[PDB]
Amino acid sequence: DPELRSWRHLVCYLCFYGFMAQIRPGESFITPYLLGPDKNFTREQVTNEITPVLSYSYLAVLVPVFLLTDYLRYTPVLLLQGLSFVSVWLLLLLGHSVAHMQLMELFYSVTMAARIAYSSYIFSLVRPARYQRVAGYSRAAVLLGVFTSSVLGQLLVTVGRVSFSTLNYISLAFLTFSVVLALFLKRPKRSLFFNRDDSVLARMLRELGDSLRRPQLRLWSLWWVFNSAGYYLVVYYVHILWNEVDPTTNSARVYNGAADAASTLLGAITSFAAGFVKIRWARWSKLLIAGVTATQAGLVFLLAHTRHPSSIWLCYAAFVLFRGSYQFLVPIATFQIASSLSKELCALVFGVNTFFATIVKTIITFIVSDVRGLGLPVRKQFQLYSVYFLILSIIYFLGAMLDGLRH
Ligand SMILES: Nc1nc(=O)c2c(CCc3ccc(C(=O)N[C@@H](CCC(=O)O)C(=O)O)cc3)c[nH]c2[nH]1
């Protein structure tokens, strides 16, 4: 039996690791570094040979990491999320070929599949009577981490006047510190699926069938499969589009970290404002999806049809508002799906709704974005993502009227 750690020395260390694991100052400046004068990649080599591997590998490492999170009891996947971080920035700084960058998207996809390895780690580390206070602190330390990583990434690049290569060495110093902090995390002794002391498969699938016939779980899983697949396709490719609108030689004029800190801050407000409307706007739920996906159709169209370099600040605001539109509906989706679900069925449905959204993200990425598919440039393929949300916002508006006229 291992010694119980001090309680105030654990929540302070869960919040300090969860803050320091999000410090990647050169993360918003990966694409202006790859497309810059430091890396020798063509604009069509990044958007068609490199960036679709971020979607392919995330389909390949999604299942494995989702199962190894519960099998290894959530600590070596927090180390694998930090060591694949080091392997991304070791390939940013030392990789030169296109295959070295497709390997970098293989290691970045491990860090995206192991993003739930920290929210589900505190779920199994902390007793349920004490969980909602630590999960409130650690979600505030993660959100403070991804905010100030983009602020420190911006102040070093704009105010500090450091290069993108020096910023990736500052990021590699913060990332080897996050591997050291992940070593001293307290590994749990019982997980949710594979390391409990006991079937679970029988309890879930008997409850999954009865909870699949709810018209709030099906509606917000259909949102999670399709509206979140189009969201990350805009998120992966908007920095390639900002390198087309404002191709500035100076790194201090980039402001990619100022737009990924504003969309973190605006995404925090819309996630806070969604806690007040997740239970009461459940009636007008298809109209809330169609009202936001129509806004997400206009902002991608506004991104796809700005070509003047002085209107790059409109392209930053059309993405901060784009992220804030999606982060408004995620706490509403998280509640309407997981309302009457078991905690083992929350991790199964959200693990499947992420997996089905990654299949849709892989199918579009291969057809629209890959050089083996259509090979479209970032500006033309942002016009197909604009009519992707418009087709989605038509279906949820027709679904709000084909079921709004029944009474
Ligand atoms: N060439 C190239 N360009 C890139 O942009 C890139 C990246 C970043 C891709 C990436 C960025 C954010 C999220 C994501 O899921 N974002 C989260 C959190 C972000 C935050 O909090 O700031 C979200 O849900 O918004 C998912 C994926 C890795 N390798 C790359 N290679």
From Swiss-Prot:
Changing residue 24 to E: Reduces methotrexate uptake. Reduces methotrexate uptake. Changing residue 236 to A: Reduces methotrexate uptake. Reduces methotrexate uptake. Residues 70-73, 122-135, 278-283, 335-348 are cytoplasmic. This is Reduced folate transporter. One of its GO terms (molecular function) is folic acid binding. It comes from Homo sapiens (Human). It catalyses: 5-amino-1-(5-phospho-beta-D-ribosyl)imidazole-4-carboxamide(in) + (6S)-5-methyl-5,6,7,8-tetrahydrofolate(out) = 5-amino-1-(5-phospho-beta-D-ribosyl)imidazole-4-carboxamide(out) + (6S)-5-methyl-5,6,7,8-tetrahydrofolate(in); 2',3'-cGAMP(out) + 5-amino-1-(5-phospho-beta-D-ribosyl)imidazole-4-carboxamide(in) = 2',3'-cGAMP(in) + 5-amino-1-(5-phospho-beta-D-ribosyl)imidazole-4-carboxamide(out); 3',3'-cGAMP(out) + 5-amino-1-(5-phospho-beta-D-ribosyl)imidazole-4-carboxamide(in) = 3',3'-cGAMP(in) + 5-amino-1-(5-phospho-beta-D-ribosyl)imidazole-4-carboxamide(out). Changing residue 132 to A: Reduces methotrexate uptake. Reduces IRF3 phosphorylation upon cGAMP stimulation. Antiporter that mediates the import of reduced folates or a subset of cyclic dinucleotides, driven by the export of organic anions. Acts as an importer of immunoreactive cyclic dinucleotides, such as cyclic GMP-AMP (2'-3'-cGAMP), an immune messenger produced in response to DNA virus in the cytosol, and its linkage isomer 3'-3'-cGAMP, thus playing a role in triggering larger immune responses. Mechanistically, acts as a secondary active transporter, which exports intracellular organic anions down their concentration gradients to facilitate the uptake of its substrates. It is linked to Megaloblastic anemia, folate-responsive: An autosomal recessive metabolic disorder characterized by megaloblastic anemia resulting from decreased folate transport into erythrocytes. Disease manifestations include hemolytic anemia, hyperhomocysteinemia, and low vitamin B12. Serum folate levels are normal, but erythrocyte folate levels are decreased. Treatment with oral folate corrects the anemia and normalizes homocysteine. It is found in: Cell membrane; Apical cell membrane; Basolateral cell membrane. The chain crosses the membrane at residues 12-32, 47-69, 74-94, 99-121, 136-160, 166-184, 217-242, 255-277, 284-304, 311-334, 349-372, 381-405. The chain holds residues 19 to 457 of 591 of the full protein.
